[PDB]
């Protein structure tokens, strides 16, 4: 019942500073432009201890499945090969990606009727707001 309030189908409704976040992570120009235009649907489900998060857009369809606290391999939408760990911290899903000596954190939280995604790399934050589809 750990993630019940996250489960469902969510659609992107607003983005701020995402291009700059992608620049900080190292995403190249053409990927940034195409990715920045996307309006993904995020589909979150839980089966037992396994959480699955899908992102589906004209840019890319991605999928991760994981157990909280248990590291896994992820290929990101921009094709980084990262080691990821997702935990729950005070009701916030905290997703840390490590690659090439670098780190970025993506936080997902329920706030009112929204699911708010905060992507942070060094001093650059991007906020992406999703609502139920
Ligand atoms: C090239 C983009 C790399 C960073 C993606 C970060 C976030 C994510 O975790 N998944 C995802 C996948 C595709 C696109 Br476009 C945007 C997102 C973001 C979000 O949920 O809105
Ligand atoms: Br996307």
Domain residue spans of the chain: 4-132
Ligand with minimal distance to 78 CA: 1
CATH class of 4-132: mainly beta
Kindly provide the resolution of this structure in angstroms, with one decimal.
1.1
**Length of the chain, in residues:** 133
72 to each of 17, 36, 79, how far by Cα in Å?
A: 27, 26, 15
The answer to whether the beta carbons of residues 59 and 37 sit under 8 Å apart is yes
Experimental technique = X-ray
Ligand 1, atom 9: nearest CA belongs to which residue?
Answer: 106
36 CA to middle of ligand 2, Å? 7
Structure tokens at 94: 């905290």
Measured in Å, residue 78 CA sits from the centre of ligand 1 at: 9
Ligand nearest to the backbone CA of 128: 1
Q: List, as residue ranges, the binding site for a fatty acid.
A: 128-130
User: Do the Cβ atoms of 82 and 96 come closer than 8 Å?
Assistant: no
């Amino acid at each position: 019942h750990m993630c019940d309030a996250f489960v469902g189908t969510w659609k992107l409704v607003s983005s701020e500073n995402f291009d700059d976040y992608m620049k900080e992570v190292g995403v190249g120009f053409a990927t940034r432009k195409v990715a920045g235009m996307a309006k993904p649907n995020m589909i979150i489900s839980v089966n037992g201890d396994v959480i699955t998060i899908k992102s589906e857009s004209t840019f890319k369809n991605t999928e991760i499945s994981f157990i909280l606290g248990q590291e896994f391999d992820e290929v990101t939408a921009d094709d980084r090969k990262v080691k990821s760990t997702i935990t729950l911290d005070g009701g916030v899903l905290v997703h840390v990606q490590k690659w090439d000596g670098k780190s970025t954190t993506i936080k997902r939280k329920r706030e009112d009727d929204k699911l708010v995604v905060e992507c942070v790399m060094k001093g650059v934050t991007s906020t992406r707001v999703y609502e139920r589809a």
